[PDB]
Amino acid sequence: MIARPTLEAHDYDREALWSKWDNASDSQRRLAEKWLPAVQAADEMLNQGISTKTAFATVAGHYQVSASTLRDKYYQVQKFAKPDWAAALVDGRGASRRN
């Protein structure tokens, strides 16, 4: 769950990123909360060396979410810091612009 981890390395200011979250509506926070447990849980399934088809199908079976959607989101947050994922989930659907 979101808490208050110590701020260390800062190549880019992270407070600005969190500042937008603080201004996010309560409903938006709920959406990010819903997708944080599935992405972290999926990572654990991958380290077990389970087939991706079974790994994604099992999460989709336990979680009522589209398997294809979770797969796209998992790689998208890979380029972002692991702890800013809660803030990164405040973004709408994947950004079409890549740069």
DSSP codes of every residue in 29-81: HHHHHHHHHHHHHHHHHHHTT--HHHHHHHHHHHSSS-HHHHHHHHHHHHTS-
Are 59 and 71 a contacting pair, CB within 8 Å? Answer: no
Q: Which residues neighbour 7 within 8 Å (Cβ) at sequence distance 6 or greater? A: 14, 15
Q: Which residues neighbour 66 within 8 Å (Cβ) at sequence distance 6 or greater? A: 60
Are 56 and 70 a contacting pair, CB within 8 Å? Answer: yes
Are 43 and 71 a contacting pair, CB within 8 Å? Answer: no
Task: Walk me through the domains of the chain, giving residue ranges and CATH numbers.
Answer: 1-99 (1.10.10.60)
d(CA 37, CA 69): 14
Q: Which helix (H) or strand (E) holds 85?
A: helix 85-88
